[PDB]
Symmetry: C2
Subunit: 592 residues, 2 copies
């Protein structure tokens, strides 16, 4: 009777609810797009993040909620877009002739059409990921909030000549800012999100990714501590990274205990360089990227420098100590396909030749060689005469066949003189040199850290994994130099036998030979050499780890290692700036 006063308390509660709802923060799902404009392809990366809008606080992204939903299809790389445009508008073999770059300004719309074909494929792919991975309720939130796009180019067009690349970016941004209105997804960009990223930045962003995913980087009490003097330190040591991609290799490490460096070495403070907001703990990080050290890049330059040395090249046969006994290939830097019959199919197509980028850079018709002897000498010391036409620039002279000798020690010594410690810097490395480091050997010589290191890159990992699979390395392997050189010496001493089931690697113990592993021994020599240079440093890393991925809260990786998560964080963490660019201006800045 007087117990139906619960009705009174129901009405008061309906009011109380309605008021909490109008005073609290509200969470909403946002999609973010990072377009990886790499050396071998242009690829979309679709992320999902949780946003929160608070009364009198605006809207912000929860950094720990960032997750990769899908990395899409491998489309045309930017170098191919640009070189196809030059092929049609400057004429064929523009690589071997002087070109009047001014005259190319009359072909900007034609470049726009070239760029349009690629962007339509990427948008189509991005929208399919978004349509297939999201429910209807999620799509409402993602479609309403707008979709920030971050297209960044790396090593592939980093060394591109003249004004062409920077003009392409202008076209790419206009293309992104005008998506099809049909799908409903509001993609948008600006010159801060869509731009070429320097090697040092590519390196800094992969360092931010690693530390974020591994929970070493944070500003909350769980990941950091404020001392009695108001300085915020991270609870766990920030880890450094070595990433070996398709065309370049990055070496990034934080400097421990506020170390004193030589004046020539340029370290970067995360706060002063506006990489990380002031609320995050401070760090002085060494970040250096080497062109010609990526997987495809180093393979073309290694063959060309090795097979130009009379200790290796004799009577038409180049003896390659980095290749297996029984392995044989055509004397070229062209893409290798290991056929089912055991034979090595060397691709003749100039675009697919691994020396094409270097030979394109190394031309007297490129103002960067034409006006600078230092750059010409760098080319010539890597056996590329810039005066010769493109076809002979990439040709291995007086060489018909390359024969594998499977001698790991000779491979290590060759990787050392050619790639790790060359007499002159490898071509197109002014960024590294300006930082104080001409080569890899100089890195751990001038700067060293006790910071733990993570080695990344497909082939960097396959080097260690293969040796672990054959029980040549312990599963707990932690970077022991002698233990790796002994394992690789054994694996690399293997004979290639051609059987009914194809080419096999025989171990005294067997695995099949293929296009991914035929030259894995070169990467093992690169790892050995790098560990040796790391072990000679004044300060040695606390540990070294090879990780394919980093597990998230649910024992499953939230996102991939690389620069993509880092580039997002570098924008989203600057709360005031992100709110104005992504939400205040937003996609509506494009209403026309």
């Amino acid at each position: 009777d007087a117990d139906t006063e619960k009705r009174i308390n129901v009405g008061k509660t309906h009011l109380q609810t309605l008021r909490n709802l109008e005073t609290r923060c509200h969470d909403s799902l946002q999609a973010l797009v990072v377009i990886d404009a790499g050396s071998s392809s242009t690829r979309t990366n679709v992320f999902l993040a949780k946003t929160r809008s608070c009364p009198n606080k605006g809207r912000s992204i929860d950094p720990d909620s960032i997750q990769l939903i899908r990395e899409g299809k491998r489309f045309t790389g930017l170098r191919v877009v640009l070189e196809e445009w030059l092929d049609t508008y400057a004429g064929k073999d523009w690589e071997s002739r002087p070109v009047d770059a001014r005259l190319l300004f009359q072909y900007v719309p034609q470049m726009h059409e070239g760029a349009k074909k690629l962007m339509q494929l990427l948008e189509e792919d991005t929208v399919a990921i978004l349509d297939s991975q999201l429910n209807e309720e999620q799509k409402v939130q993602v479609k309403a909030l707008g979709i920030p796009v971050m297209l960044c180019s790396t090593a592939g067009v980093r060394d591109f000549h003249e004004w062409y690349r920077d003009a392409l970016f202008v076209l790419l941004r206009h293309l992104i800012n005008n998506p099809s209105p049909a799908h409903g997804y509001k993609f948008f960009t600006n010159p801060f999100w869509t731009r070429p990223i320097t090697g040092a930045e590519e390196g800094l962003f992969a360092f931010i990714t690693l530390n974020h995913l591994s929970r070493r980087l944070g500003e909350d009490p769980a990941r950091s501590m404020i001392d009695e003097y108001g300085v915020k330190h991270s609870r766990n040591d920030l880890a450094g990274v070595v990433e070996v991609g398709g065309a370049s290799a990055q070496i990034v490490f934080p400097l421990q205990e506020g170390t004193v460096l030589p004046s020539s070495v340029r370290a970067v403070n995360l706060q002063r360089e506006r990489l990380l907001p002031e609320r995050y703990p401070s760090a002085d990080v060494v970040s250096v990227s080497f062109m010609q050290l990526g997987m495809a890049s180093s393979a073309g330059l290694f063959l060309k420098e090795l097979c130009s040395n009379d200790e290796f090249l004799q009577g038409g046969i180049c003896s390659n100590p980095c290749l297996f006994k029984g392995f044989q290939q055509s004397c070229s830097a062209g893409e290798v396909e290991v056929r089912p019959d055991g034979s090595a199919s060397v691709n003749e197509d100039v675009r697919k030749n691994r020396l094409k980028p270097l030979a394109t850079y190394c031309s007297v018709h490129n103002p960067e060689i034409s006006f600078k002897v230092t750059n010409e000498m760098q080319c010539r010391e890597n056996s590329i005469d810039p005066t010769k036409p493109l076809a002979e620039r990439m040709k291995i002279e007086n060489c018909s066949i390359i024969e594998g000798t499977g001698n790991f020690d000779k491979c290590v010594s060759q990787v050392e003189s050619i790639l790790v410690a060359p007499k002159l810097p490898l071509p197109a490395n002014i960024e590294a040199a300006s930082s104080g480091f001409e080569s890899v050997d100089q890195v751990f010589r001038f700067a060293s850290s006790t910071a733990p290191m993570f080695i990344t890159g497909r082939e960097m990992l396959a080097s260690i994994d293969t040796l672990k699979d054959h029980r040549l390395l312990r599963s707990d392997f932690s970077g022991d130099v002698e233990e790796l050189a002994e394992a690789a010496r054994e694996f690399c001493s293997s004979e290639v036998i051609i059987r009914t089931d194809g080419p096999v690697i025989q171990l005294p113990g067997e695995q099949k030979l293929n296009s991914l592993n035929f030259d894995l021994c070169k990467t093992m020599a690169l790892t050995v050499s790098l560990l040796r240079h790391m072990a000679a440093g004044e300060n040695q890393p606390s540990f070294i780890k090879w990780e394919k991925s980093i597990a998230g809260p649910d024992g499953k990786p939230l996102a991939d290692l690389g620069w993509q998560v880092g580039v997002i964080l570098h924008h989203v963490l600057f709360t005031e700036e992100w709110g104005r660019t992504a939400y205040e201006a937003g996609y509506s800045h494009n209403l026309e």
Copy 2:
């Protein structure tokens, strides 16, 4: 008329109400210590600060005025090298030194630095005491005195870690002034630091445009368009600055200048040089080491007198020196004596090749690990494997004789300094921005931007010619007019008169006194011709080429000098909130026990 007496009382209330509502102006002192190649000298400035209720305190940028540039004390290079002489031992330039061992002498480096800082402090205080009245001292003393000690070309190429450890010591000394005087000096790692050659040039570019009223944020100097973009009312001007050890070339790019990927231009706002409320500009800024007055004089004699075309029988034939002029074959400091004779100082520290020969050493990691740098040293006739004494020596040379051949002078300045085969040593900064040399600057980038030429000798070049009427008052930068004039003056004869030595002009054009400052002035006339030719070769031409000793400030007299000093102040003071936090909130009180 009691209605009048009540109005006096209402007036008394209004006056006090106005006072607690209005903004209040107060005087502040700002110190810029120029740690240059030749010396370390103070620069005392005054500015008007203004505090407004609920708005804090700020400096009126236009009120910035130089009171005095102080005495020329020891350069940071000398302090560091003197320290190395004592703790790494004598002749460390010719033997390997373990740099790790030198950390045990860090307190001793603090003592060396303390001697210099105390001389600069006594000079700064004497300058203030002499200019300020008793009311002005009270405001200046209460407010705190920001100090900006910046190092340029002299220690830009200093080896190992030495210079950066020195900076940490320097800031500690500045943050602990003599309490006796009452001037509350203070610094931080943002104000006191080595400045790059690019920063050095950008700061000089800011000073020119600030003082000349070209750079502004208000309606008088700027204009906001229908698309909300703020434009400069007048074209911003570029600067060519020639110092003691380096030379800077700075010019804004006029949209849309075609830039290659290799050429890295600076956006003022994006690069946090100027606040966002200021008009945007994309600026090419490049500095060249060995192009300064002293460093280029040393390098020039080395390369010229190691050339078979000029060196024969122990006589080096110098086309840049006057006919009848003679000196001993060394890059030492020249003193022109009353008896016509030239006295060359043989002290190693006074030698103008010392900084280059010190950089160019097989025991310097920048040479021993980098063939690139070793070859730049060798291309300039310096063998880094040799002792310092033979690295500074012009081999098989006793006498340098002047030939007064202007065209031959131009030819050699072009070859050695302007367009050398390899970049001149210690120029990784220039090369990283896309430029190996001065010639490449106007080739890869050029602007229609008006250009101003600055430097002691740069000005004397044009002035000397005008004085003997070989150039017009209206000389606008004509290469052929200048090359004609300089050819006549440079073919002058050295005549010894009762009053002293004289530079006698041909065809009875007159004469002038011969001294230690003008004996090699033709080298700079040749450098000017060379620079104007490269500038004229550009796709875009500077609207005008001007030479200025100083910029006339409001009320006739100049408010400050040309150089990077005003610019570094503005680089800090213009960022309102951040300057308020650093200057006024934390202030000299950050230093309290």
